[PDB]
Amino acid sequence: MKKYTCTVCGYIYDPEDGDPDDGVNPGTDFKDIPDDWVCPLCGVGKDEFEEVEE
Ligand SMILES: [Fe+3]
């Protein structure tokens, strides 16, 4: 389960962690995060995120 980064501000989504405050529980892979979700720091959509190929 891979991490994703917001390319506009650097936030990193960690599927272990999730984004619970926004309704994205731990263990939610990026692709299953509802498509209306936006970066918690900067507010941008998911289409500015990239998978962290480390
Ligand atoms: Fe961001």
Swiss-Prot record:
Disulphide-bridged cysteine pairs: none
Record bears the keyword Cell membrane: no
Sequence ranges assigned to domain Rubredoxin-like in this UniProt record: 1-54
GO BP field: alkane catabolic process
Pfam families reported for this sequence: Rubredoxin (PF00301)
PROSITE patterns: RUBREDOXIN, RUBREDOXIN_LIKE
Annotated positions binding Fe cation: C6, C9, C39, C42
Domain of life: Bacteria
Cofactor note: Binds 1 Fe(3+) ion per subunit.
Keyword terms of this UniProt record: Electron transport, Formylation, Iron, Metal-binding, Transport
N-formylmethionine, modified sites: M1
GO molecular function annotations of the record: electron transfer activity; iron ion binding
Matching NCBIfam families: RubredRD
Role played: Rubredoxin is a small nonheme, iron protein lacking acid-labile sulfide. Its single Fe, chelated to 4 Cys, functions as an electron acceptor and may also stabilize the conformation of the molecule.
Family: Belongs to the rubredoxin family.
Name this protein carries in UniProt: Rubredoxin
